[PDB]
Amino acid sequence: MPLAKDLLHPSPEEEKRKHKKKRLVQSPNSYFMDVKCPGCYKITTVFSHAQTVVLCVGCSTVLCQPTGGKARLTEGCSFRRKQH
Amino acid sequence: GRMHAPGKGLSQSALPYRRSVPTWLKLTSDDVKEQIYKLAKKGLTPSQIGVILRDSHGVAQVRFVTGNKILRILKSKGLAPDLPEDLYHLIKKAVAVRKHLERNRKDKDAKFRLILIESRIHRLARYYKTKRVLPPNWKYESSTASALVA
Amino acid sequence: MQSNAGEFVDLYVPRKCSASNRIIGAKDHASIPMNVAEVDKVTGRFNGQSKTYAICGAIRRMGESDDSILRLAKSHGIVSQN
Amino acid sequence: VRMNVLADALKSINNAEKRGKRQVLIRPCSKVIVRFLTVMMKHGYIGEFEIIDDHRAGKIVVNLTGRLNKCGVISPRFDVQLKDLEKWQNNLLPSRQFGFIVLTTSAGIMDHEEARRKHTGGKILGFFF
Amino acid sequence: SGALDVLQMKEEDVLKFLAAGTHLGGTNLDFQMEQYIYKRKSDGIYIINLKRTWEKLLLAARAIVAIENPADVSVISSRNTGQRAVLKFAAATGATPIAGRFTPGTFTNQIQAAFREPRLLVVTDPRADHQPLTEASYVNLPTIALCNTDSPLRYVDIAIPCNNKGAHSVGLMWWMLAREVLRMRGTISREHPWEVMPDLYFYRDPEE
Amino acid sequence: SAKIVKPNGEKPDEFESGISQALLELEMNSDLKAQLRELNITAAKEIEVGGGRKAIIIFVPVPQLKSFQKIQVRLVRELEKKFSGKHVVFIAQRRILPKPTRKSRTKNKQKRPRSRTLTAVHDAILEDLVFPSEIVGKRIRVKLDGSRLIKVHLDKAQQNNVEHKVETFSGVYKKLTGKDVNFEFPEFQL
RNA sequence: GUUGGAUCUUGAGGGCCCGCCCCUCGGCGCCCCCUCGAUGUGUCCCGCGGGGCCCGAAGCGUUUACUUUGAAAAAAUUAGA
């Protein structure tokens, strides 16, 4: 900072790069998404940082694999939050 | 500040402002209550139920559909675990450390660790006793810790 | 520094600043203003009538001053290509 | 963690002001902080503030001015029966001609000049000048 | 401001800038130069914003104007590349010139073999003209300076983003400065550009 | 059937009679049959706003509101057409437990949560006015003068629906509480 | 032992100030008695005086510390007329 700035409506790239609880208006950026993926024949809702796998009846096993960060997905997928 | 762990970091999620999540499909009260009842039949903790509901169903927390949370539903029904989930899992660690300590009597680390976990149980339990979630006439013991986890 | 209803105590009235809202005291070093010339515009060629900004010891030693002058100058006008 | 919230806010502003910085993020945000800021603001010691609302506990962004010299906190609070106010005022303020001791009275959080008129004492929060 | 169309730049300047290699900057992150930056070149290096370079140059120029004697602005360079540069500026504008070594104490020292009386200093890099920059803040003198993204900003009032080390970069900025001050007050007049080329400035350029 | 829409012990008439007749029409009207046939509003109140059209504030006891909110924009659009430019919305009013003072009466209390208190009711009213966007966040700006204006952030997706509404929402809030509300779009999504 | 996060509502008069909002009394009133005007053991203006019940008001709802006003608070001393 040049040490005299005052910011009352901060840009969303210096507030969206920061840690989840360090944000200047605190809501996380995590979302839900619909996964289509072709070996599943139903539209499974999945959490972006799912943790434990989401699975469904339509697939044998192919929907998610676990990852500590963002959940792994396989083949065709979409995402829309929608409205967080 | 932490006197219950040697940590320095964080261990909670950020939570959103709103009382409605995600607002494109929040399902209905009916669906998730049935699911909760069926999961709680199997003896699953509120933690586990929250995880599976979040990711698979279009609900996140069930606090955003109705003002009740998973524990509150359970508690009012009268079908609930018989001690808080955290307290259970604490007791369970102290059992596991105790079993390891029986195996090895040269493991100084394990002795130190056991003390810490046990202290942590007592402070949490004291809190539950005062607010009538535990009876004051129960108390933590080696003996009874085993019996709970089994 | 007034006394009573508006009697004058005082040896002099010091300069102020508006880049940090702090007075320039009493004989201090690195305290100078900055007269930027006005230009009359449109026909060009300097016409009076200085715009003056007051710079204090404090701001300069904390290496603020560059940015500050622009904020002060822009806010009250006027320089081409704003 | 935080056993006083006034003390953190007051320091935060002063440390900003030293730099020439015109913003702070104070938190956890409380009713007393709002009240202290408004009385301070009215006399011109600080500029306007804006309370951002979260479900955590709130966060306030104060735009400050350098019309302040020191806002001190009297922690732990003491009783003032309007005959220790005089003792404080000579002790801890540079003159009796300016500066306010700000207290909390049962008739509201008020500056000590107003306290003197009411003749209602209470607990001393802090001061500024 | 002035008459106004060519003080919002023009293609002529944008060509001169690109040619002189002004545009490239350092690789050190900023906190006082950061505002000025247009965009960052891939894997470090900052592209300075010519729009910002303009406005600062004009504000600088304007401050030299409103003095009816141009002698009491000291143009200072200790850099080789800018020795010729400042010498031409002094001929043109009528500045009192300081090329090569400054020689410590000319704004200080009551007993000295030289003394100069300025009112405003113009510096080409305040990490090479560090002696004037320090000396000036002992005797209450404002200092403009040509600053990159790793120059000191302490005791500098108005910075002008620019590479301002070596090549034609130091030359060109002296040319454009001289052109600007002459527009407002000189004999180019009417806020239109110089008929002198920047090549009279620049460095000596080893003579074959 | 409307039979309770006008009864409230209010002296008018004019607007309530209009609204009650409107309710009967809507009961039969397509895609709104079988959801107004058992749910009939307690009262209607008319208060003006700075848009130069009057605003019709309808009162719901909270259970009704869910059905009204479901449709909202389409229903309000029809009612605006019907009443020639009046802006219709739905506001929820709870009983609200008495003041935590003492004198001036503190009546009967039993535990008063912060989800049924005076502030909670005002927040709930704000939420109810909108439908296709939600309240992302809020900020209140305290002016140097001493005035406060509350900027209510709304979702930056599906915003259009609330954009035209804004002026009436501002005015109605002012009439009811004595505080001005203004609406804004943030900097979250995108 | 010490210390401890956020969070609950109170328009006029005059050029601030006042009461308010999201039953032992006084008394809006209702019923009683000597009755007060329609009347002179007694009404239908009313509880006005004694009552009961019961609203703006008020114990109101659950406690305080604090602070504020009173009393109770040796003379000499001491400040001080």
Domains and CATH numbers, chain C: 1-82 (3.30.1230.20)
Q: Is A9 on the interface with D (CB under 8 A)?
A: no
Q: Which amino acid is at E140?
A: N
For residue E51, give the nearest of C19, C47, C52, C70 by alpha carbon.
C70
Inter-residue contact F136 to F188 (CB < 8 Å): yes
Cα distance from D55 to chain B (closest Cα, Å)?
6
Q: Please, which positions of strand G sit below 7 A from a protein CB?
A: 3-10, 19-22, 56-62, 65-69
Residue position matching structure tokens 């999620």? B13
CATH classification number, E13-208, choose in 3.40.350.10, 3.40.47.10, 3.40.50.10490, 3.20.20.30 = 3.40.50.10490
Neighbours of D15 (CB within 10 A): 11
CATH number of the A1-84 domain = 2.20.25.100
Interchain contact A2–C (C-beta under 8 A)? yes
Q: Which residues of F121-143 are buried (b: 16+ CB within 10 A; e: fewer)?
A: bebbbbbbbbbbbbbbbbbbbbe
| Total number of domains in chain F | 1
Is the CB of A4 less than 8 angstroms away from the CB of C68?
A: yes
Domain with F43, as residue range(s), is 1-190
Tokens of B39: 């999961």
Domains of chain B plus CATH, in order, are 26-80 (no CATH), 81-150 (1.10.287.10)
Nearest CB to F142 within list D49, D53, D54: D49
**Structural determination approach:** cryo-EM
Beta bridge partners of A65: A72
Report the DSSP pairing between strands E159-161 and E143-147. parallel
Q: How many residues does chain C have?
A: 82
Task: List CB contacts (< 8 A) between D52 and chain F.
Answer: 137, 139
Partner D contacted by C21 (CB < 8 A): yes
Chain D window 16-35, residues with Cβ within 7 A of nucleic strand G: 28-31
What value, to the nearest 5°, has the Cα angle with vertex E99 and ends E98 and E101? 90
Q: CATH 3.30.1370.30 spans which residues of chain D?
A: 1-68
Q: How far apart are CA F94 and CA F120, in angstroms?
A: 10
Q: State, as a whole number of angstroms, the distance between the CA of B1 and the C1' of G5.
A: 13
Report the candidate in D83, D26, D81, D85 with the shortest Cα–Cα distance to residue D58: D26
Cα separation, A82 vs B24, whole angstroms? 6
Query: Looking at the domain D69-129, which fold is it?
Result: Dna Ligase; domain 1 (3.30.1490)
| Contact between residue E59 and residue E142 where contact means Cβ atoms under 8 Å apart | no
Residue numbers in F 151-190, CB below 7 Å of strand G:
176-177
DSSP F27-55: HHSTTSTTSSSS---SEEEEEE-TTSSEE
Torsion of CA E33, E39, E41, E43, to 10 degrees: 70
Of the CA atoms within 13 Å of residue A24, those in its CB half-sphere come to 22
Residues with Cβ < 8 Å from F155, sequence gap 6 or more? A83, A84, B23, F133, F134, F136, F189
Spatial distance between the Cα atoms of D58 and B131, rounded to a whole number of angstroms? 28
Which single residue is written with the structure tokens 């499974």?
Answer: A44
DSSP letter for each residue of F49-106: -TTSSEEEEEEE-STTHHHHHHHTHHHHHHHHHHTTSPEEEEEE----PPPS-STTT-
Domain range summary for chain E, segments of one domain joined by +: 13-208
Protein F96 CA to nucleic acid G12 C1', in Å? 27
Report resolution in angstroms.
Answer: 5.8
Question: Which of D33, D37, D50 is the mutation pick for testing F, counting most F CBs within 10 A?
Answer: D50
Q: What fold is seen in the domain D1-68? A: Ribosomal Protein S8; Chain: A, domain 1 (3.30.1370)
Question: Going by C-beta distance under 8 Å and a sequence separation of 6 or more, which residues neighbour residue F131?
Answer: F69, F72, F73, F161
Please state, in angstroms and rounded to a whole number, the distance separating the CA atoms of residues E133 and E141.
Answer: 9
Closest residue in E to C48 (Cα) is E66
Q: Among B1, B15, B17, whose Cβ lies nearest the Cβ of D1?
A: B1
* Residue F154 near residue F143, CB atoms below 8 Å: no
Per CB-CB distance under 8 Å, the chain A contacts of C67 are 2, 4
Write out chain A residues lying below 8 Å of F186, CB-based.
25
State the CB neighbour count (10 A cutoff) for residue F111.
6
Type of residue at F65 = L
Alpha carbon A41 to chain centroid distance?
22
Secondary element (H or E) of residue F24: helix F15-28
Q: Give me the helices (H) in B22-84, please.
A: 29-41, 46-56, 70-77
The nucleotide minimizing the C1' distance to residue F106's CA is G61
The kind and range of the H/E element at E90 are: helix E83-92
Q: Can you say whether the dihedral through the CA atoms of E11, E13, E19, E25 is positive or negative?
A: negative
Residue F108 CB-density burial (10 A; 0-12 exposed, 13-18 middle, 19+ buried):
exposed
CA distances from C36 to E8, E142, E153, E193 (A): 19, 12, 20, 21
CA distance A79 to D64: 43
